[PDB]
Amino acid sequence: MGAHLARRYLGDASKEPDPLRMPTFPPDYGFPERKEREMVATQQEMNDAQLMLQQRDYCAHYLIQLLKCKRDSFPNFLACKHEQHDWDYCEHLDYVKRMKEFERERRLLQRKKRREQREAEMARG
Amino acid sequence: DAPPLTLEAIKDRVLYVLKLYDKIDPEKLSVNSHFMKDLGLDSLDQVEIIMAMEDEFGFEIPDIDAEKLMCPQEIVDYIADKKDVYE
Amino acid sequence: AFSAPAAYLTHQQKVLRLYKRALRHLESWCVHRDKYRYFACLMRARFDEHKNEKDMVKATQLLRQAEEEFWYGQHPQPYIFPESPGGTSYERYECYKVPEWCLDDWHPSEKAMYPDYFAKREQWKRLRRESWEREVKQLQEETPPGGPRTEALPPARKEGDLPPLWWHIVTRPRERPM
Amino acid sequence: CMHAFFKAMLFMCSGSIIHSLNDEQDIRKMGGLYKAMPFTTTALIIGSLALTGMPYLTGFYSKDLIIEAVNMSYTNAWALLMTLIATSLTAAYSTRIIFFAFLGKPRFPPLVLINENNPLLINSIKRLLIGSIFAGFIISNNIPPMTVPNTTMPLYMKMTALIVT
Amino acid sequence: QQERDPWYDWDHPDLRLNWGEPIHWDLDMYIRNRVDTSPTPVSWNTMCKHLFGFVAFMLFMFWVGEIYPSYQPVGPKQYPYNDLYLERGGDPTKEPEPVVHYEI
Amino acid sequence: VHIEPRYRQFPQLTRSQLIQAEFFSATMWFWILWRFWHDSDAVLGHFPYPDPSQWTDEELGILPDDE
Amino acid sequence: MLKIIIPTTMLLPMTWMSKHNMIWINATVHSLLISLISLSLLNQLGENSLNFSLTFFSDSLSAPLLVLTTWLLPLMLMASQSHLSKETTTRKKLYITMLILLQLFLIMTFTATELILFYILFEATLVPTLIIITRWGNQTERLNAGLYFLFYTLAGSLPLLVALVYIQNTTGSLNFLIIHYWSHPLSNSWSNIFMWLACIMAFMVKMPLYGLHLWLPKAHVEAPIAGSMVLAAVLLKLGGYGMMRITTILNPLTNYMAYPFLMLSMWGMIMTSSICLRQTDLKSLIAYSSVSHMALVIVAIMIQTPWSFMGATALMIAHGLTSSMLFCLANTNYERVHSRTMILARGLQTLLPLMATWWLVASLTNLALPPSINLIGELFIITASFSWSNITIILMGMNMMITALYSLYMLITTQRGKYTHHINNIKPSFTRENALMALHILPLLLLTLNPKMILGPLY
Amino acid sequence: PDSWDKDVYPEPPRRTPAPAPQTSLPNPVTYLTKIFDLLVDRPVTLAREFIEQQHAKNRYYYYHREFRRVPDITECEEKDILCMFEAEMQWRRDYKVDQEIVNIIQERLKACQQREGESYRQNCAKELEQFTQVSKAFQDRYSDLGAHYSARKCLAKQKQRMLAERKAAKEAAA
Amino acid sequence: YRHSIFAVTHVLIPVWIIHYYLKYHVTAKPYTVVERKPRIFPGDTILETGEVIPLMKEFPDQH
Amino acid sequence: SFPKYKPSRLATLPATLDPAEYDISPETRKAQAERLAIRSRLKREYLLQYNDPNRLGVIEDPALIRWTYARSANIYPNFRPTPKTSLLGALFGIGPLFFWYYVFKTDRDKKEKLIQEGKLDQTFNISY
C-alpha cells in the first residue's frame, strides 16, 4: 500500500521506479566518490553461527551477538533486550538505505524524463 | 443427567402454560376441559396452544398428531407416551 | 406419527399447517421474544382478516398466494428442535435401540444374572401367545370385504382381549435406551 | 500453535453451553448466559479476544505479525485486500457469537438446568485459559529469531490490524 | 427419500420405504446418504449464476492483482559476498561476476 | 455441589465460580495493561518512518538538471 | 516339493477313511500342518531359484503363492462345514476331495518348471472348480456361470497350447531356465504379433482383462463360499504368474503391443470401480472390486519394470487375502438372512459388534490404508506407472478415490443405520466365524511387518 | 565406536562449545540431565554390563563368505549354458554390490545434510558431487534393462554405448 | 500410591527400554542418529580440542 | 409480485407451490382414496406377518425381489440394438479408449524424442 502505487498505476509508469529492475542507473552516476558497504561478520563466522541464508545480510553481527546472548542466559528469556534493540536498529538503518535507493532511482528517472523532453523541444525548435 | 419427568410434573407444566394463556379463564380451567367445546377457542387458538407446549417441553408435535389434542389431559397423555413416562 | 393419515388434507388442515409453519419461520426471523410476539399477532391478524370467507374458490386462491409468499420469505436456516427430523440430535440414539428378540438369544448365564426380569418377560411372552388368535379373528371380522380402506386399527371390544397388533407398539425400545 | 490454544478453548466453551441447555446448539435459543454461566462467559470472552488479536494475548504474537508481513511484502493486491476484509469479518462473527449467546434476555425453555460447577470442566477450561493469555508471550520470547522483522513501517500500516478489527 | 415425509410411520424408517410398495429404479442413488433432490429456498438457476459469478469474479480479480502487485517503496535487499555466491552453492573454482553494494 | 434445577427463575450460582471468573478476567486485564506499560513498542512501533521528500538531492546523489 | 505334494495326496485317503464326524477335524488339522511345512519355502535366494529337481522349482514369486494356497485350504474347510451341515457323508467327502484336488493342482502349477506342464496343470484346475460351482452352488444360475467360466478360459487358453508347442518346435525347449538364458528378441512381424497375442490373451482372459471379465461376476456370485474363496484369492493369480513368467520371450514386442491392454486396464479399472458404486448385490460388489485390482496388476505387468513387478506381487498376495475375507463376511450375512441383497440387512453393528469390527478391518485393507501390503503394492504400481507416463497418475488417483468411496459405502450400508425391524433371526456370531475372520486378517498385518517376503524376485 | 568403519562412514570432528552461563538462575536442563543420568542411564548401563558379561562367556564367531571370480559373459561362448549360468550369477552379485555402494553414498549425503543444518547447500558440496558421479555411473550401467534384466542385455547395452562413443570420437576427429 | 505405581511402570519401564535400545542397538550402526552440529559464535571455547574461536572485529557502533 | 421459483431436476418443486394441488377434481379425490386403500392393504399384510408370534426369519419383500431382478437379470432380455443404444454404446465404450490411447501415445512419443535428442533431465533417475 502507498501513494507510489497510485502514481505508477494511475499515472506515469515511465517516471516511477520498477522494483523488479531497480537499479537502472550506475551506482556512481552523480556520486563522485562512493564508499562500499562494510561487512563485519565473515563468511566462516556466519557459517559457524548457522545463520539462515536470508539472515546473512549486513546486520549479521548483531544477530550473532543476540544468539550468543540468548544461549548464555537461557532461563532468563528477558535478558537480551539490548542485543535485540541493536539488531533491530541495524535492520532499521538497512531498510532506510533501501528507501534512499528507491528515492534516488525515482528522481533520477524523472530527471532523465525532463532532460529528454528538453532535448526533444530543442530539436523541434 | 436431567431429572426424569413425571405425570404430575407434566400436568403441572401444561396447566401452568394454559393459565398463562389470556383467552382461557384460569378459574374454570380443568384437566378435562375441551379447548372448543367448553372453552370457546378455535383452530388457530389450538395451533398456538400446541406451539406453546412445544416451546415448553422442547420438542415438536407433528401436525397429524397435534390436531387431535383437544384437552390438557390429552396433551399430558401424548407427552408422557412420547417421553416414556409411566409414573 | 402415532396417528394414521387420511387420503387427503382438507382446506382447513392446509390453512392451519401454513399458519404454524409461518409462525415458526417468523420466530426464526424475529429472534427476540417481544419482536416475535408483535409480529405473530400481526400474522394472526391477517389470518383472522381472511377467516370468514364463503367463496371457497377465493379461499383456495388466497391460500395459494400465501404459500407463494411464504416460500419467497421463508428463513433459509429455520430453527429446528434437536430431536426433530432436521435437528442436530435427530436419530442419535438409534444405534442404542435393541429389540427384545435380540434379548432372548442370551446365554443362560447372562439370563441368570437377571432372574426377576426374565420371569416378567416370560409372563409377557405368554400374554402375547394367548391373544394372537383373538387378535387375528377380530381383525378379519371387522374388515370390509374389499380390504382395509385406511391404516386405522380397532380397540379391544371385550373385557379379556387386547388391541390387535399391539406387541411392537407396546414393546418398542425406549427413547433413551442405553 | 496459538490458534490451537484459543480455538480449542472456544470449542470447549461452546460445548459447555450446549450441554447446559439440553443439547441445544442454536444461538437463537441461547441467551442470558453472561450471568447464567460466569466462568464459561469469561473464558469465551478471553478466547474471542485472543482470536481477534487483542494487543497482548496469545493471538497478537502471530496474527499481528502475519498482517504486518502481508502488508509489507510484494504480494497480490487482491490477496492483501481479502486478508484485511477477512480480519474484519473475524471480529464480526466473534461479536455475533458473544451477542447472541450471552447478552440479552433468555430464550431457552423454562426448565433451567444450567450448571457449570463441575471441577473437570472448570479445570480443563482453566488450563486452556492460562495458555490463551500467556503462552504467546512465553513461546515468542523463547524461540530463536528465524526471520528478519519488519522494524520500519508507516504508523497507519502498523495499526492496520487493530483498525480493521 | 429425503423428500419423503419424515413424520410418517414407515416400515423402514431410515430408508423411508414401506413393505410391498414399488421401489424406484434409482433407489440406490436416491437414499438419504446420496443424491438429494429436495426443493431449496433459492432456485437452482439463481444458485448456479451466483456461485459461478462469485468464483469467476474472484479469479479475474486475482489475475488483476497479479498484474498490479502491491509492494513497498524500497530497493532490492543487499547481501554481502557477491549476493552470497558460495552460500547458495556457487562453484568455488569459478569466479563469480562481482556484486558491489555502496553506501547511501 | 448439587445444584437444584430452577423453573422460570435464574439458576443457582456458586461463590467459587463467581470468584474464579472474576479473578481470571482481572488477570487478563492486568496482563494487557502490564504488557502495554512495558512493551508499548510492539503496538505503536519503535523506529520512525522516513519521509523520502525531505532527503536532499545532494545526499541522494542527484545532479542539477542543467548539468 | 515332494514333501509338500505327497501330504496332499495323503489328505485324500485320510479324508475317505476317516469317520463320518471326524472328516472336518482331520482335514482342517492336516491342512494346517501342510501349510506350516510349506512355510519353509520362503527361505529364498538372491541370485537364482530353488531348483529342487528336473520337474519342480521354486522362486520368490512361486513361494508366497504356494503359502497362500496352502493357507487358504483350511479356511475353505471351515466355511464349507458352515454351509454343508445337512449333506451326506459321501457328498461331504466328495466336496473335500474337490478342494484337495484343486490345492494339489495349484501347488504343481506354481512349481512346474516347464511351460507345457504348467499349461496342463493350470488347465486341470478348471475341472474341480467347475464341479464345485455347478454342483454345490445354491441358485439356478450356477449352470450358466459354469458354462461362462469354462468356455472363456478354454477359448483363451487353446491358442496358448498351439503357441507353446510351436515354441518348443522352434527353440527345442520349454524349460523356463533354458528359455530365460537362451531368449532372443521378438522381431516386429505379423507372425510374432500373433504369437504374442496367443500367450498374452490366454493369461488376460484368466486375469481377467476388462471386457473379458463377465465370467468373473457370474462365477464368483454363483459359486459356494469355498468356490468363491479359491476363485478370487488364488485362481485369479494364475494369470499374473503366467504373464510374469512368459514375458521373458516376448520382448521387445511387449513395448509396442501393450498399448491396447494398458488402455483397457486403466479405463476398465475406473469403470469397474464405478460399477461397484451402484451394485445392489454384495457378492457382485466384491467381485467387481477384484476386477479393478487385477486391472491394476495387469498394468504393472505390461509396463514391466522392476518396481512394477514387486508391486504386482504384493498386490496379488494382498488382494487374495482381502477378497477371501470379504467373501467370508458376506457369506456369514447370507447364512443369516438367506439373501445377497445389500440393503436387506442393516444395523448389523448394533446386532453383531465383533463382526462389525471384522467388516471395518477388511474394508480398511480393501482400500489402500498405509502401511498395509495392499497400499505397498498399489503405490509401487502407481510409481512405476508415473515413470511410464504422467497421466497414469490421474487415472490411478481417480481409481483410489472411487475405491475408498465404494468400500466405505459397503461398510456403512451393511453395518450402520438402523436394523431391519422384521429380521428377527440374527443369532450371535459363532466362534468358527470369528476365528475364520481372525485367521484371514492377522497374516495380512504380519506381512505388513515383514514386507520383503511378498515383493517377488526383483526385490 | 569400532562398530563401523570411519573411512566408509566418515563424520567430521564434533566441535561442542563450552557453556558460558551469565545468570544466577539454575539451569533446568542441567538439573533434568542429572536426574536422567541418575534414574535411567545408570540402570541401563548396569543391565548392559550384566548382559555383556553373559555374552563373553559364550563367545563364538561367524565369517564373511568369499566368492572367487569366474569367467564373465563376454568370455562365455554362445549357448554354452554352464558358463552362461556362472557368468549370470556373478553379474547378479555384482549388481547387488553396486546397489549397496549407491546406498552407502546416499547415506553419506543424508547424514551430511542433517549434520550441517542451515548451511548444507555449501557444506555438502563434496557429498553431492560424489553422489552425482556414483548415480550417473550406476544409471548408465543398469538404467533401462527391464524386469527381465540379464548379463546379455547389459552386454548389449554396453556394446551400444561403445559404438556410440566410437562414432562420436570419429566425428570429432574428422 | 496409585500414581506412584503408574509413574514407575508407564514412564520408567518404557524409558529404560528405549534408552537401552538407542544406546546399545540403534547407535551401534552408522548414521542412525544424526545430530545437527552445535552453533559456534565468536569468542567461544571449543571443548573438544580446548580451542578458542576468536571474537568479531570492532563494530562501527552508533549511539 | 414475489420472484417465482424455477424447479430443476436436482431441486424439485415443493408440493405447496404445485398448481395442481389447488385444482382438485372429484376424480382426484377417488384416485387418492384408491392409493390409500392400496397402502392400507399392504400395511395390513405386513403388520400381520410382523406381529405373528410364531414367525421367525425375514418377511420376504416381493417389491425388493422385483427391484433386484429388474436391475440385473431382466436387462438383456429387454435390450434391443437401436440407433440410440448403438451410438451410446460405441461412444461410451470406444471413445474413452482411443482418447486415452492418443494422450499416452503422444506423451510417450515426446518423451522418447527428447531422450533420443539427449535433452531430457534424467539425472538421479535410478529407480524405474
Ligand SMILES: CCCCCCCCCCCCCCCCCC(=O)OC[C@H](COP(=O)([O-])OCC(O)COP(=O)([O-])OC[C@@H](COC(=O)CCCCCCCCCCCCCCCCC)OC(=O)CCCCCCCCCCCCCCCCC)OC(=O)CCCCCCCCCCCCCCCCC
Ligand atoms: C484314494 C482316495 C481318493 C483319491 C482320488 C484321486 C483320483 C483317483 C481316481 C480313482 C479312484 C478310485 C475309484 C473310487 C471309486 C469310488 C466310488 C464310490 O462309491 O465312492 C464312495 C465310496 C464309499 O461310499 P459307498 O459306500 O460306496 O456309497 C456310495 C453311494 O453312492 C453313497 O450314496 P450317495 O447318494 O450319498 O452318493 C452319491 C455320490 C456317489 O458318487 C461317487 O461315489 C462317485 C465318485 C466319483 C466317481 C469316480 C471317478 C473316477 C475317475 C477319476 C477321477 C476321480 C476324482 C475323484 C475321486 C473320488 C474317489 C471316491 O454321487 C454324488 O454325490 C454325485 C457327485 C457328482 C460330482 C462329483 C463326482 C465326480 C468326481 C470326479 C471328477 C473330477 C476329476 C478331476 C480330475 C482329476 C482326477 C484325479 O468311497 C470309497 O470307497 C473311497 C475310495 C478310496 C478309499 C481309500 C483307498 C486308500 C486306502 C489307504 C491307502 C494307503 C496307502 C499307503 C500309505 C502309506 C502308509 C501306510
Ligand SMILES: CCCCCCCC/C=C\CCCCCCCC(=O)O[C@H](COC(=O)CCCCCCC/C=C/CCCCCCCC)COP(=O)(O)OCCN
Ligand atoms: C510347540 C509345539 C508342540 C505341540 C505338540 C502338539 C502334539 C499334539 C497335541 C495336540 C493333540 C490334540 C489331542 C491330544 C490327545 C487327545 C486328547 C483326547 O483324548 O481327546 C480326543 C481328541 O480327538 C480328536 O479330536 C482328534 C485330534 C487328535 C489327533 C490329531 C492330531 C494328530 C497330529 C499329528 C501331528 C504330526 C504331524 C507332523 C508331520 C507334519 C505333517 C505335514 C477325543 O476327542 P474326540 O475323538 O473328538 O471325541 C469323540 C469320541 N466319541
Ligand SMILES: CCCCCCCC/C=C\CCCCCCCC(=O)O[C@H](COC(=O)CCCCCCC/C=C/CCCCCCCC)COP(=O)(O)OCCN
Ligand atoms: C461434450 C460431450 C460430448 C460427448 C462426446 C461427443 C459426441 C457427440 C455428443 C453426442 C452425439 C451423439 C452421440 C450418441 C448419442 C445418441 C443420440 C441419442 O441418444 O438420441 C437418438 C438420436 O440419434 C439418432 O437416432 C440419429 C443419429 C444421429 C443423431 C444424434 C447425433 C447428432 C450429433 C450432432 C453432430 C454434432 C453437431 C455439431 C454442432 C457443433 C459442435 C461443434 C435417439 O433419439 P430419441 O428417441 O429421442 O432418444 C433420446 C431420448 N431423450
Ligand SMILES: *P(=O)(O)OCC(C)(C)[C@H](O)C(=O)NCCC(=O)NCCSC(=O)CCCCCCCCCCCCC
Ligand atoms: P379454525 O378451524 O377456526 O380455522 C378457521 C379457518 C381458517 C379454517 C377458516 O374456517 C377458513 O377456512 N376460512 C376461509 C379460508 C381462509 O382462511 N383462507 C385464507 C387463508 S391464508 C390467508 O389469507 C392468510 C395468509 C397470510 C399469511 C401468509 C404467510 C406468509 C408469510 C410467511 C413468512 C415466513 C417468514 C416470516
